[PDB]
C-alpha cells in the first residue's frame, strides 16, 4: 500500500525534474526525491586553527569557509547514518531537529 | 520468475517460431 | 632520541570495537598551552602522564 502521500518526494505539478547524481554511488536520483544537505565547514578544523593563527602573517584574517552541497540517494543516506528510519507516526514530521 | 524476463522469453520464442514457420511459408 | 611528555587532563571515552582503547585529551608539559587528543591502550586516569614517541598526530575523534 501507499507508505507516503508525497510518495517519496516533492513532485506535484511537474511530471519530470531532470535528476542529479548521488555523490557517493553516482546513482541518478531525481532532484526532489533526493535529500539535499549543505556541508558548510571551516577549511581547517577546530584544532589546528590555533597553530595556523600562530604561524600566520596577515593577522585577524578570516579563516574562510568551504561550502559544498551534497545529494545522497536513499540507500546511501540510510547507510551513512542520516535520515535513517522512523515510525509510522513520526514519518509525517517534516521539520528538522 | 520476473515477469519482465518471462516476457523476454516469450518474445524470443515468438521470434523462433515466426522464422521456423517462414521456413515453410 | 626525542620523546614528548603529555599530561592527561580529560578522559573522553572508550573506543575501539572491543573496548581496549581510550580517547584522552592531554596537555603537553613542555610547550604548554598545547592540547592534543590521543588513543591509549591500557587504563588511564586524569593527571597521568604519557610518553609520545611522536607528538604530531591525533586520532579521529568519535563525535
Amino acid at each position: 500500500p501507499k507508505k507516503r502521500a508525497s510518495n517519496g518526494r516533492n513532485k506535484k505539478g511537474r511530471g519530470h525534474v531532470k535528476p542529479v547524481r548521488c555523490v557517493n554511488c553516482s546513482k541518478s536520483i531525481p532532484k526532489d526525491k533526493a535529500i539535499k544537505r549543505m556541508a558548510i565547514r571551516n577549511i581547517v578544523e577546530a584544532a589546528a586553527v590555533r597553530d595556523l593563527s600562530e604561524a600566520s602573517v596577515y593577522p585577524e584574517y578570516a579563516l574562510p569557509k568551504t561550502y559544498n552541497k551534497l545529494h545522497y540517494c536513499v540507500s546511501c543516506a540510510i547507510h551513512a547514518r542520516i535520515v535513517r528510519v522512523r515510525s509510522r507516526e513520526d514519518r509525517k514530521n517534516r521539520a528538522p531537529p | 520468475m520476473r515477469a519482465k524476463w518471462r516476457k523476454k522469453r516469450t518474445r524470443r520464442l515468438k521470434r523462433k517460431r515466426r522464422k521456423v514457420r517462414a521456413r515453410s511459408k | 632520541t626525542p620523546v614528548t611528555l603529555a599530561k592527561v587532563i580529560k578522559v573522553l571515552g572508550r573506543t575501539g570495537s572491543r573496548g581496549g582503547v581510550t580517547q584522552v585529551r592531554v596537555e603537553f608539559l613542555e610547550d604548554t598551552s598545547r592540547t592534543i587528543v590521543r588513543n591509549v591502550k591500557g587504563p588511564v586516569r586524569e593527571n597521568d602522564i604519557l610518553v609520545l614517541m611522536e607528538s604530531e598526530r591525533e586520532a579521529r575523534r568519535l563525535r
Binding site: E60, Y61, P64 | - | -
Partner: protein
Amino acid sequence: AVGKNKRLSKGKVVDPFTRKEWFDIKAPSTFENRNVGKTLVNKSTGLKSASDALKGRVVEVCLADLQGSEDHSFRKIKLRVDEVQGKNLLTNFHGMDFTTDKLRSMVRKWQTLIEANVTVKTSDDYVLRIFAIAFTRKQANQVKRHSYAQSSHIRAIRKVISEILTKEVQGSTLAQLTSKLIPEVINKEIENATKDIFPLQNIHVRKVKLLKQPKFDVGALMALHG
C-alpha cells in the same frame, strides 16, 4: 607504494636550485603596493634567453595584498609579465576574479540570483568580458521568507547592468577601469539604477577576463611604472 614500481625506465644528480636565480615582481602604479613577491627561472644561457621563458608568466595575487586593506580581501587579481629590465620584472593587468568562499557565501537559497556578462572593448583597443552578479534581498518590514522576482524585473535589471558596463568601459582604457573597479563605484551605480526596480543586495561585480590584447606599445606600459 614505494617499492612497487615494476620498471622506472621504458628503454632500460644535478640539483637545479643552484642553476636558478630570483627576480622580484613590480605591479603597476594603480596599486598602493608594487612589490608582489619573487619568481624563479634558470640562468639565462645563450640558447634560451630566460627573459622570453619568463615573459609569458601569470601570477594571481590578492587585491588586499596590493592595497593593504582587508576590505578587498577576496578580489584576486591576475597579473601578466610583459617586460624585464634587470631583475625587477614588470607586470600589467590580466584579469580579476573572486574567491569561491565569498561567492558561495553570497549564494544562499530563498533569494533570486541575477547574472550578466558583456563583451566590450576599451579605449586602448583591449577586449574584456566583464561579469556582473546580483542578488535579491528581503526588505525591512518583510514577512514572507524568500524575496523572489518576477522574471521581467530580472531582464530589465540585466539590460540596465549591461548598458552601464558598456557605457563605463568605453572611455576607460584599462588602468582607468582598474581604478574604477577598486573603489567599487560601479556597484554603487548599479544599485542606484536598480533601486527603482528591485532591492538588489550584494552587487559586487565579478571576475573580468581579457580575450585579446592590442600590440605591446612599451611606452604605455612604462607610463605606469614611474
